[PDB]
Swiss-Prot record:
GO terms for biological process: (+)-camphor catabolic process. The gene is camC. Its EC number is 1.14.15.1. Involved in a camphor oxidation system. This is Camphor 5-monooxygenase.
Length: 406
């Protein structure tokens, strides 16, 4: 019945069958679907018999604590169940302190705040270019027409790769995270590595100032980073910034299309866009992965067994009423916007700075040119749930005569 037999160490009163890949009432919205785990009668920590059987921390306090305690909660394979990530081998996902430290520092060198600030004007140009091409059309499939092209073009800029390589590169990343049956994950991954390796070896000899050159010439354990290590980190620097951004932007634009008050608020108070970005990140949080118990451990009165998998939904912390008043409501003026949208602990998103800049630039440049838009008449928006939840399709409409080319 898709149900995994309840392990002896798990008390029956903590059972709550939740399917993270197809939650009940997903039609009400994915965040709302996950919020069922936070209804009054549900414990802070539960066990679901779906997807092979695993724990699920449902409150921000437990989620933050588990992510900080890497000694008890390992990131060896954050995919639950393990088969959900197949041949995944990106760095530094599966590493924990100390091994993890060196790789994070090198990655922070290429996508950290200083780099983001230097790339802002170009990111702004890319955004304006995409929005302006859509403006006169009076409609668009947001996810395909803006959300997807934006992040991949940003990567080419960051990695110093030619625009002409997008069709191939984007096809491969889509084959990996949004498979259509053409290639297996392993095959798509190998093809991605076949693309990266030559560029890495080349820039290892004649380096530039791009992200790949810096990574290729990095130092690990007092010795040059290997071709294997470099490609495995570059692969995540690429894939980690695509679907998360694509879907987050889609959730945010869906909300704005349905709320004229919030659009009007940002048009009249542009200086609030950064704050609005943070509140949208909280309300439309979308990632949910986990950790593995390194040893038998008592956590908040619950006995966890070595090897057990525990889902620690990054999405749930900010939706927790114990963290934020009326969590399902959007308030750009919230004084304390508590969330773990980019994660928490040692694995906190390395691209958080780049992500925030992409969101802020998108909101400013879109609201400046297309201030009044709505969901296409007759359309019904559907969400999808998983490790990175999202929007299937987002058809938008507007009157071109009400827009302004800037
Ligand atoms: C709204 C957009 C984004 C969200 C919500 C997001 C979320 C996350 C989360 C929750 C984690 C931690 C996962 C865990 O602890 O297992 C993570 C890790 C990571 N993300 Fe992001 N991400 C976003 C954008 C980006 C971008 C733009 C990049 C690429 C430039 C990126 C690169 C990475 C990398 C490399 C890691 C690995 C960190 C590590 O394992 O130490 N992310 N992301
Ligand atoms: C066992 As369930 C996917 O309900
Ligand atoms: C899907 As894992 C072994 O990383």
């Amino acid at each position: 019945a898709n149900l995994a037999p309840l392990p002896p160490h798990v008390p029956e009163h903590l059972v709550f069958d939740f399917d993270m890949y197809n939650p009940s009432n997903l039609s009400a919205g994915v965040q709302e679907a996950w919020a069922v785990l936070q209804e009054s009668n549900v414990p802070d920590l539960v066990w679901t018999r779906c997807n092979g059987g695993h724990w699920i921390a449902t409150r921000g306090q437990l989620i933050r604590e588990a992510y900080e305690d890497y000694r008890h909660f390992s990131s060896e394979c954050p995919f639950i169940p393990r088969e959900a990530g197949e041949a995944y081998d990106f760095i530094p996902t599966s590493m924990d302190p100390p091994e993890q430290r060196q790789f994070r520092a090198l990655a922070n060198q290429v996508v950290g705040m200083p780099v983001v600030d230097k790339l802002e004007n170009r990111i702004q140009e890319l955004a304006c270019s995409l929005i302006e091409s859509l403006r006169p059309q009076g409609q668009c499939n947001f996810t395909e027409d803006y959300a997807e092209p934006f992040p991949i073009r940003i990567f080419m800029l960051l990695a110093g790769l030619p625009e002409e390589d997008i069709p191939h590169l984007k096809y491969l990343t889509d084959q990996m995270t949004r498979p259509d049956g053409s290639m297996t994950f392993a095959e798509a991954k190998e093809a991605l590595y076949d693309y990266l390796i030559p560029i890495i070896e080349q820039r290892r000899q004649k380096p530039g100032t791009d992200a790949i050159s810096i990574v290729a010439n990095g130092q690990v354990n007092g010795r040059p980073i290997t071709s294997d290590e470099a490609k495995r980190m570059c692969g995540l620097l690429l894939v980690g910034g695509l679907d998360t951004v694509v879907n987050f932007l889609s959730f945010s634009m869906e909300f704005l299309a349905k709320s004229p008050e919030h659009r009007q608020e940002l048009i009249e108070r542009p200086e609030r866009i950064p704050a609005a970005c943070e509140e949208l990140l909280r309300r439309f949080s979308l990632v949910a992965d986990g950790r593995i118990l390194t040893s038998d451990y008592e956590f908040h009165g619950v006995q966890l067994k070595k090897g057990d998998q525990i889902l620690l939904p990054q999405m749930l912390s900010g939706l927790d009423e114990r963290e934020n008043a009326a969590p399902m409501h959007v308030d750009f003026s919230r004084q304390k916007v508590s969330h773990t949208t980019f994660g928490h602990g040692s694995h906190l998103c390395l691209g958080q700075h780049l992500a925030r800049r992409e969101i802020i630039v998108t909101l400013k440049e879109w609201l400046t040119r297309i201030p009044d838009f709505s969901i296409a008449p007759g359309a019904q928006i559907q969400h999808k749930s998983g490790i990175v939840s999202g929007v299937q399709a987002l058809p938008l409409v507007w009157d071109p005569a009400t827009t302004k080319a800037v």
